[PDB]
Design a protein around this ligand. Structure first.
Ligand code: ADP
Ligand code: ADP
Ligand code: ADP
Ligand code: MG
Ligand code: MG
Ligand code: MG
Ligand code: MG
Ligand code: MG
Lengths: 528, 532, 232, 98, 526
């Protein structure tokens, strides 16, 4: 070029244009896919990422791994974004989206290299994705019998399939039973905040329990708390948002007196206000008192003298779960403590779990909430158990919304690839190569399963292709037997929407990446 | 645990790194392939500029650090040394072979199977080329040489002037033809001296029916044109005689000093007189000549050229019939020179070429020699014309030695890809995949050719493959083997009819060298880089 | 095999994927497993010399120079300044064992180190680590069932504390208080039994106040059925 | 048209083929290009579409103005010819309504 | 650990940017000297890095004194040097033409036309340009001195020497005519070696003249020697006239008393014998490229011989050509033919404060010197450059007697012919053909712009005039800015100069259009 004494853009502006930048973008997407490639399948492995502060995160979740990775490549960020999208909309398949998008891009990289117009590739991807989604909706197996037992079995199988890739896969049936039971007790919105997840260090995975009620950690007891009884057999629970303390009446309040009689009267009036609140709470008939605001030592001793239980500074979400379990109402004022606003549980108890004190509200017959208590040898262990249970819970919620399932293990994608190849063999031909490339890219997931399991991917893929061609829809990778099997009969089930969203997001990401021809990076401002 | 003072890369990391290096080297020169290719412009970080299209020159000038990229660079250098043409094609083919082999390996195909498949595919491709895709030059004639030269000079700075440059190249090559023992006509290229001098246009380049020397006469008093030249070639300096280390002059009688000093020069004077007594007109010597012998030659009206290059002197002596004389000494112990050691030419002149002068030994007898003076507008274009002219001379030499030529413009690669894709089904299970990937990799040449012209590469290559498949399936449409690419219109065309030819040795050697390079790089699965 | 990836594109243009990728390290595949196994083996071999009645002590010095001579594995690993993540996992495992049980915080580390040491030579023979983990889980289930089978019951009555005294003595036998062994076991058993919800319920350690004052002798340690305050 | 990934000084991605957005996220420094960008932004404000048309037309006009200045015309003559042609184009445009 | 493929200092650019940058660099080269063309051109001051000042308007000098970094600019500088060396005139014209062709090629490169099509169109256009130039040429009678003087004048009207046109024309014509030589059937001019230009600051420019001989800056070795000889017989030598050591080691061994004196006496006797051998030819002047001993000077003065020592080899060759002598290295082999008879006067005179030796009355001399007297060193350097231009033009005319109309007439005629030819192409390459055809109008356009008249009106009128039948000789009057017939104004250019300019410009455009990728920063690897 030329110096051009006065230049157009600010100095340091880096621009890349043409085929080389698109090839570099595809390579970056391949690099991103490599970082999560070995996390897929029952034989998948965990990744450990350490941040600057020195904290380590161990996860089998694709979205979590990608988020912990601090990606700065403009094209590579699209894969992380679609992983987040899949996590948000579905909750499972965050590795499959990245693998599928990267495989699409890798398959169309050669055609890009001869200078094929990107619009043709985008149109081919759009057509192939529409056909694949329609085929998935057409061939997805659904049961229109509304059988409660069959629905429970389907939910349990889906949860097991969603869980048989994590570290809790050994107890996958037991955890899936917990997850299904917990989800079935949510009322109509299946809100995630209505399922408590408590992680307590110590104990094996089999020691983890689901509480048909609500449980939370003991919250900074005051003096005289240890004299309160710690077990009740039909308690009435008073859910309050009240500070039971000896304090100023108001921040701007100010008392002006000119007689010692008025001084004593004011002191006794403050004491009488506190005692009136406490007496109202006591005469409400409640035995267990929980408050969001602090409960003072005076109130603690007052409740201890009456054989009552008190617990202040309870977290707001814990109070909401206690509401949904026992069936009371949080009161900011104690002036009207009727039986309507009082919670009720069969048994309240405080026990010790791994060197911590927890309060239990069990026996609730009409509870709309749950509480998972997770046990493990390390905090990252419990964190990843929570992540796996979150994946299972999201899968079960989606299955509740619509019970349309397809066989896993790559069987659905092998069927889709066969169908797409059959479609591509009957078109003019410029789109035929791209649709065939899409169908071939659809084979990445079973091949990755075989590679992770230590299989021979080529032979398994050939057998799967032959079986699908000769007849058979739900034949996928059998990880245990080094062969293929009818995965529908093996109860390897996934919701159809999981694959639908995965294909849609991967295709959108591939089209967006291909549609870019120039990348411009402005010089950094305020580098500091 | 290993405690090796260095960096270690193992597994797919090093394989991908090697493939990336090879791909980068291929991408550097991929834009200079085919007639619609364009030259590059190298700067030597000191102001030196090089404009070239030759792949070997580009890869030699670049400084390369990665071992695999080096491997490709010396691969191009070897291809240039042993053939002279196809230097870019071999690098591109090797890099594409490496890419597809790495793809197969990443698909968990063992590299040994890929190597065996590549070896089988290379052998079968060479066999198919030799059996189906060769054309004999016996029934073509001089037109085959002209077309081969024109095809070689396409994609070069002398492309449009091919109608003239091909004639010049063919005449120059045929002028230096000699037959050795076994009755084999040999064509000693690099015996055609190439002289570069800016000035008139490229069309004014001259083909000398003789030899051209990049040197002038030593003294302005000598004539600058001799009609009936009797060339005397010498390999010793004509200066004042000085005695060796083992000889020392010690004077005791002072009367002998003058005689000693006079004889010191009288020895050389007698040698000059002996040389000139035979009628010699042109005297060429590799050594220097001082003023005294220059005046001796001036008085006799004879040429005298000093510091003549040894190779130039050898060529002049061989052409003119003169014999190099490193010394004047017969088998009788005397010091004599007879007319038998004199070469003959019918004119020796000193022409002026753009403010400079050079000596032309025109029409030497007893053997015909040739030389080319390239006229351009600056030094860069003259150098590029020299490189392209050398490529054309090498191509013509290959065509004249081996009388087999193959269609150009991607026809050979397309036919090979079709045949190998068909044939792979009859060999093994995974080596079948290796042979199929070899066949697919062979298609990069037409792809790059089409891309460089901004043509529809996909559709054009598909049409080429369809034509070749029809040729190989239907046994009466075998004439479609010659259907290559016509980059002017972006359509398939019968290249044999169009006169687009290449020597078969170019394709054979390029295939063999690219396959061996891909095998060598593919063998690596680990790298240890010790700190310096 | 380390530092991540360094390509800078096949066209020469910059190829930046991750922020500060030039100064970030990465371990891939089997070598990461071998490094983790070696670190865990080092931790376990450090711990194993403090196992049993004849086990020796470790003298821990913190960042402020304070010295803590101890035999408790959980305390040693908690006060150990490690940087390797697998060592931190060992520390958390010891803390987990201490929180859940309170004893055996040194046996768990030795057992895990032995398990990983055997897994090393199993991996060297070409077995997927997931299969090793599954086999370990199966064998652990078998061992737990056998432990339940061969277990024996003891009476936890307050009238006969001999089995409780023997269990406390076995627990204390590896500590420095083995000189006052029987008195220590007696006071521990009596302290637990005095404050405990009898119906097999929890034992509230908040009601057991452990106070220590220098001077006197170890034999002067006593159980006081009341409260000791640092006032007058 | 092809989308462009433009990254401003705050590391914010902008993948788009909208000319006004691209110019807004570009750190344009040449003041003549600043006038052109301001004209594009004014077109976006007044109508909402046609910014790329404004850029292309201004660039073509200035290229041909440079050609005319090179061949010998003065700046004032080029300006008056451009204004006359713009008036003629505005007169013609209503007749092209389909 | 920078693994890298290429070295970190290697940088690669490719695509449209490289072509645009190359064409812009060529345009900038053209724009540097655009204003230095035509009779009304202005001069430029160049400051050398060594402290010297080069005040000139010659294109090649200006481009040579400029250092550039963009290698396309280096290519353009090489083009300038090639044009100067080949013909000696038309440097600014070729630079401007190359720039204009590259601009009109960039126009097509902006569209979707491949550079190879443009290059092929350019080559076809160049062939037609050569054909048209050969068609519109006219012969010259070289024996007509008036025509030669007019041609030289037309060459030098655009230079600072134009104030003294007849004098410069006569100097150049006489020098070229009497340096012309023919030997053994070979014809030569050889302006480079002989026909020396010697400039002495001071005096007036009107005193400049070309001597019928040679002049050197030398004085007699001894004052007693004659400084004015009527009809000298000159003898030239290369070898020294002093005792010198031998080639081999020649240590002596003295044991007798008289051997030292004998050695010294024999040294003196050797000098005497050499001087006697020289005197045997009875010469008057002895010239040597090497030193002459004092004893040799005495022995020469004894025979009334003037001696000059330490002369340059080129000067000695020039003297040999001028006075009809040949240089002899060994005095004992001095033949009669070696003695230089033909010089008609030798005179040593002092110019300013320095002695100068004149051999300036030779009959039929084949070498000459041009004595320039001027205001200062820079003025004399510019006058020497103008004289070089004139002498190159004269020798080109002598070699090729064809002329072509100047003042823009030739460019417009060739452009019209090529435009008429392009009307039957009916292809896709007709557009670049016509573009490069009409790009030749930049020469009349530049002439008009430098003159200060209206460019568009004058070019339109000139094109309309050239559309007629017999109007190939109509051009631009560089002074008055009017359309005149060049057979009336009398401005003509040698056909060789125009042909070289057109060929070189077209080939520069072809060479620069062929390039689309630049890699730089690598080591020399020599
Ligand atoms: N028992 C099984 N047998 C074969 N394949 C399975 C099995 N369980 C899960 N998969 C496969 O694992 C893939 C998803 O892997 P996983 O890590 O569980 O979720 P994600 O896709 O979110 O990473 C699915 O495509 C599914 O086909
Ligand atoms: N006129 C033509 N038409 C079509 N293809 C051609 C033509 N001339 C050459 N080619 C092809 O272009 C390819 C590139 O050759 P080139 O790159 O010039 O040789 P090298 O590889 O030695 O540099 C050759 O393989 C040849 O087949
Ligand atoms: N008196 C004149 N009137 C008009 N044009 C002239 C006159 N003299 C010379 N020219 C033109 O000027 C050009 C010479 O320009 P000059 O400054 O010599 O450039 P260069 O040094 O590159 O030859 C010639 O092409 C000639 O046609
Ligand atoms: Mg999953
Ligand atoms: Mg070639
Ligand atoms: Mg113990
Ligand atoms: Mg719009
Ligand atoms: Mg001139």
């Amino acid at each position: 070029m030329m110096p051009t004494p006065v230049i157009l853009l600010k100095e340091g502006t880096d621009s890349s244009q043409g085929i080389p930048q698109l090839v570099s973008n595809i390579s970056a997407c391949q690099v991103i896919a490599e970082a999560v490639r070995t996390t897929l399948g029952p034989r998948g492995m965990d990744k450990l990422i350490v941040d600057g502060r020195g904290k380590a995160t161990i996860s089998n979740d694709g979205a979590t791994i990608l988020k912990l990775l601090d990606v700065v490549h403009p094209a590579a960020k699209t894969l992380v974004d679609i992983a987040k999208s899949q996590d948000a909309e579905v909750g499972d398949g965050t590795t499959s989206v990245t693998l599928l998008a990267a495989e699409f891009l890798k398959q169309v990289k050669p055609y890009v290299e001869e200078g094929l117009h990107p619009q043709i590739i985008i149109r081919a991807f759009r057509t192939a994705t529409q056909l694949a989604v329609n085929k998935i909706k057409e061939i997805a197996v659904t049961v229109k019998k509304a059988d409660k037992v069959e629905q429970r079995k389907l939910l349990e199988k889906c949860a097991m399939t969603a869980l048989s890739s994590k570290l809790i896969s050994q107890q996958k049936a037991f955890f899936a039973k917990m997850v299904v039971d917990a989800v079935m007790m949510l009322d109509d919105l299946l809100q995630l905040k209505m399922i408590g997840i408590k992680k307590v260090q110590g104990g094996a995975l089999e020691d983890s329990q689901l509480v048909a009620g609500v449980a939370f950690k003991k919250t900074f007891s005051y003096a005289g708390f240890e004299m309160q009884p710690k077990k009740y057999h039909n308690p009435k629970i008073a859910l309050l948002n009240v500070e039971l303390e000896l304090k100023a009446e108001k921040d701007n309040a100010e008392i002006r007196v000119h007689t010692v009689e008025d001084y004593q009267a004011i002191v006794d009036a403050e004491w009488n206000i506190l005692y009136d609140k406490l007496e109202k709470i006591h005469h409400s008939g409640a035995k267990v008192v929980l408050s969001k605001l602090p409960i003072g030592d005076v109130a603690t001793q007052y409740f201890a003298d009456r054989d009552m239980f008190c617990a202040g500074r309870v977290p707001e979400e814990d109070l909401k779960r206690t509401m949904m379990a026992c069936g009371g109402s949080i009161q900011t004022s104690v002036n009207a403590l009727s039986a309507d606003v009082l919670g009720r549980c069969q048994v309240f108890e405080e026990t010790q779990i791994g060197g911590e004190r927890y309060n239990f509200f069990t026996g609730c017959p009409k509870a709309k909430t749950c509480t998972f208590i997770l046990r493990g040898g390390a905090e990252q262990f419990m964190e990843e158990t929570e992540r796996s249970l979150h994946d299972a819970i999201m899968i079960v919620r989606r299955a509740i919304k619509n019970d349309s399932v397809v066989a896993g293990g790559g069987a659905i994608e092998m069927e889709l690839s066969k169908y797409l190849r059959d479609y591509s063999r009957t078109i003019p031909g410029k789109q035929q190569l791209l649709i065939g490339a899409y169908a071939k890219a659809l084979e990445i997931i079973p091949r990755q399963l075989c590679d992770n399991a230590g299989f021979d991917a080529t032979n398994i893929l050939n057998k799967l292709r032959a079986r699908h061609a000769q007849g058979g829809t739900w034949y996928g990778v059998d990880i245990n037997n080094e062969d293929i099997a009818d995965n529908f009969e093996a109860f390897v089930w996934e919701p159809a929407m999981v694959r639908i969203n995965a294909l849609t997001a991967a295709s959108e990401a591939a089209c967006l990446i291909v549609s870019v021809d120039e990348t411009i990076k402005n010089p950094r401002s305020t580098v500091d | 645990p290993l405690s090796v003072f260095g960096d270690r890369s193992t597994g797919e990391t090093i394989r991908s790194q090697n493939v990336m290096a090879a791909a980068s080297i291929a991408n550097i020169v991929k834009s200079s392939l085919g007639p619609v290719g364009l030259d590059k412009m190298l700067v030597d970080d000191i102001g030196d500029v090089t404009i070239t299209n030759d792949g070997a020159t580009i890869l030699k000038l670049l400084e390369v650090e990665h071992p695999a990229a080096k491997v490709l660079c010396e691969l191009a250098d070897l291809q240039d040394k042993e053939v002279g043409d196809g230097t870019t094609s071999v690098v591109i083919i090797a890099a594409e072979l490496l890419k597809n082999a790495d793809e197969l390996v990443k698909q968990k195909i063992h590299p040994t199977s890929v190597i065996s498949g590549y070896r089988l595919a290379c052998k079968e491709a060479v066999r198919y080329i030799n059996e189906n895709l060769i054309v004999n030059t016996d029934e073509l004639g001089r037109d085959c040489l002209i077309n081969a030269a024109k095809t070689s000079m396409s994609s070069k700075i002398i492309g449009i002037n091919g109608d003239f440059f091909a004639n010049m190249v063919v005449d120059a090559v045929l002028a230096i033809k000699y037959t050795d023992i076994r009755g084999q006509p040999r064509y000693p290229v690099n015996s055609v001296n190439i002289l570069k001098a800016h000035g008139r246009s490229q069309m004014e380049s001259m083909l000398i029916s003789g030899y051209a020397l990049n040197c002038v006469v030593g003294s302005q008093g000598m004539p600058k044109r001799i009609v009936n030249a009797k060339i005397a070639c010498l390999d010793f300096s004509l200066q004042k005689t000085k005695m060796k280390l083992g000889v020392q002059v010690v004077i005791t009688d002072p009367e002998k000093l003058d005689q000693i000093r006079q004889r010191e020069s009288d020895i050389t004077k007698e040698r000059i007189q002996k040389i000139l007594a035979t009628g010699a007109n042109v005297i060429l010597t590799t050594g220097g000549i001082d003023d005294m012998c220059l005046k001796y030659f001036v008085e006799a009206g004879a040429m005298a050229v000093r510091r003549v290059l040894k190779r130039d002197l050898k060529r002049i002596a061989k052409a003119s019939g003169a014999t190099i004389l490193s010394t004047l000494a017969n088998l009788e112990g005397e010091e004599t020179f007879e007319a038998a050691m004199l070469g003959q030419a019918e004119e020796v002149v000193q022409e002026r070429i753009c403010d400079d002068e050079l000596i032309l030994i025109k029409n030497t007898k007893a053997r015909t020699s040739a030389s080319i003076i390239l006229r351009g507008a600056n030094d860069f274009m003259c150098d590029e014309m020299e490189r392209s002219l050398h490529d054309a001379l090498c191509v013509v030499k290959r065509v004249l030695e081996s009388k087999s030529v193959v269609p150009g413009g991607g026809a050979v690669e397309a036919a090979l890809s079709i045949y190998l894709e068909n044939y792979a089904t009859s060999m093994g299970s995974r080596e079948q995949l290796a042979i199929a990937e070899f066949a697919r990799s062979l298609l990069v040449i037409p792809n790059t050719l089409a891309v460089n012209a901004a043509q529809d590469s996909t559709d054009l290559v598909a049409k080429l493959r369809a034509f070749h498949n029809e040729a190989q399936v239907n046994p009466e449409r075998k004439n479609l083997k010659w259907i290559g690419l016509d980059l002017s219109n972006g359509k398939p065309r019968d290249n044999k009819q169009a006169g687009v030819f290449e020597p078969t040795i170019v394709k054979v050697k390029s295939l063999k060298f690219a396959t061996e390079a891909a095998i060598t790089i593919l063998r690596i699965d680990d790298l240890i880089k010790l700190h310096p | 095999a380390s530092m991540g990836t360094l390509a800078f594109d096949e066209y020469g243009r910059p190829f930046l994927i991750i922020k500060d990728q030039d100064r970030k390290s990465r371990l891939m595949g089997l070598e990461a497993l071998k490094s983790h196994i070696m670190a865990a083996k080092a931790v376990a071999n450090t711990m194993r010399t403090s196992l049993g009645p004849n086990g020796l002590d470790k003298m821990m010095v913190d960042k402020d120079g304070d010295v803590t001579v101890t035999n408790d594995g959980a305390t040693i690993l908690s006060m150990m300044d490690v940087d390797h993540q697998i060592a931190k996992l060992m520390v958390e495992l010891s803390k987990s064992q201490d929180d859940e049980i309170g004893d055996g915080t040194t046996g768990v580390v030795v057992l895990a180190g032995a398990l990983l040491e055997e897994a090393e030579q199993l991996l060297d023979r070409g077995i997927h680590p997931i299969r090793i983990a599954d086999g370990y889980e199966q064998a652990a289930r078998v061992a737990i069932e056998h432990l339940d089978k061969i277990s024996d019951s003891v009476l936890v009555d307050i009238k006969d504390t001999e089995p409780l005294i023997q269990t406390a003595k076995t627990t204390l036998g590896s500590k420095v208080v083995n000189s006052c062994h029987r008195q220590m076991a007696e006071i521990a058993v009596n302290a637990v039994l005095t404050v405990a919800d009898m119906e097999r319920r929890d034992v509230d350690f908040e009601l057991i106040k452990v106070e220590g004052k220098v001077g006197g002798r170890l034999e002067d340690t006593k159980l006081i059925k009341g409260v000791i305050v640092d006032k007058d | 048209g092809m989308n462009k990934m433009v990254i401003n000084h705050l590391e914010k991605l902008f993948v788009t083929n909208d000319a006004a957005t691209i110019l807004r996220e570009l750190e344009v420094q040449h003041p003549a290009a600043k006038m052109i960008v301001m004209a594009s932004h004014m077109q976006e404000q007044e109508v909402g579409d046609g910014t790329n048309f404004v850029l292309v037309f201004a660039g073509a006009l200035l290229e041909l103005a440079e050609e005319l200045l090179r061949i010998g015309l003065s700046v004032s003559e080029v300006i008056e010819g451009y204004e006359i042609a713009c008036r003629k184009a505005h007169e013609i445009l209503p007749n092209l309504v389909c | 650990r920078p693994v890298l493929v290429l070295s970190q200092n290697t940088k690669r650019e490719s695509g449209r940017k490289v072509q645009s940058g190359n064409i812009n660099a060529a345009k900038t080269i053209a724009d540097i000297i655009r204003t230095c063309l035509g009779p009304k051109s202005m001069m430029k001051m160049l400051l050398d890095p060594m402290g010297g000042i080069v005040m000139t308007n010659d294109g090649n000098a200006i481009l040579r004194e400029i250092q550039v970094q963009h290698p396309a600019a280096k290519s353009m500088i090489e083009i300038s040097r090639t044009q100067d060396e080949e013909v000696g005139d038309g440097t600014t014209s070729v630079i401007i033409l190359a720039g204009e062709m590259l601009s009109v090629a960039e126009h097509f490169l902006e569209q979707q036309m491949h550079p190879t099509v443009v290059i092929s169109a350019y080559r076809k256009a160049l062939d037609d340009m050569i054909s048209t130039l050969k068609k519109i040429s006219i012969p010259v009678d070289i024996s007509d001195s008036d025509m030669m003087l007019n041609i030289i004048n037309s060459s030098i009207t655009t230079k600072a020497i134009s104030r003294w046109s007849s004098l410069a024309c006569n100097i150049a014509l006489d020098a070229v005519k009497m340096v012309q030589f023919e030997e053994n059937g070979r014809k030569e001019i050889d302006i480079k070696k002989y026909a020396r230009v010697e400039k002495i600051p001071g005096g007036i420019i009107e005193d400049s003249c070309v001597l019928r001989g040679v002049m050197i800056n030398k004085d007699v070795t001894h004052p007693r020697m004659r400084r004015y000889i009527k009809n000298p017989r000159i003898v030239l030598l290369d070898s020294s006239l002093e005792y010198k050591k031998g080639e081999s080691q020649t240590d002596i061994e003295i044991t007798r008393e008289e051997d030292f004196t004998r050695i010294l006496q024999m040294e003196e006797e050797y000098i005497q014998q050499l001087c006697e051998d020289i005197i045997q030819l009875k010469p008057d002047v002895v010239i040597t490229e090497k030193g002459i001993s004092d004893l040799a000077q005495h022995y020469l003065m004894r025979a009334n011989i003037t001696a000059i020592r330490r002369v340059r080899k080129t000067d000695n060759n020039r003297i040999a050509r001028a006075c009809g002598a040949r240089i002899v290295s060994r005095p004992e082999e001095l033949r009669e033919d070696d003695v230089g008879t033909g010089a008609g006067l030798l005179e040593i005179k002092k110019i300013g404060d320095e002695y100068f030796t004149f051999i300036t009355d030779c009959k039929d001399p084949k070498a000459c010197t041009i004595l320039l007297r001027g205001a200062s060193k820079e003025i004399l350097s510019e006058v020497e450059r103008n004289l070089q231009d004139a002498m190159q033009v004269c020798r080109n005319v002598l070699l090729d007697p064809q002329l072509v109309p100047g003042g823009g007439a030739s460019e417009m005629a060739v452009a019209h012919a090529l435009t008429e030819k392009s009307k039957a192409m009916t292809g896709v390459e007709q557009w670049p053909y016509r573009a490069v055809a009409q790009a030749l109008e930049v020469i009349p356009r530049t002439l008009i712009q430098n003159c200060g008249a209206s460019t568009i009106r004058l070019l339109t009128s000139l094109r309309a005039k050239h559309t007629q039948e017999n109007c190939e000789t109509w051009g631009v009057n560089g002074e008055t800015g009017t359309l005149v017939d060049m057979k009336e104004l009398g401005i003509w250019e040698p056909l060789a100069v125009k042909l070289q300019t057109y060929k070189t410009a077209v080939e520069t455009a072809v060479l620069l259009l062929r390039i689309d990728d630049i890699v730089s920063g690598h080591k020399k690897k020599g």
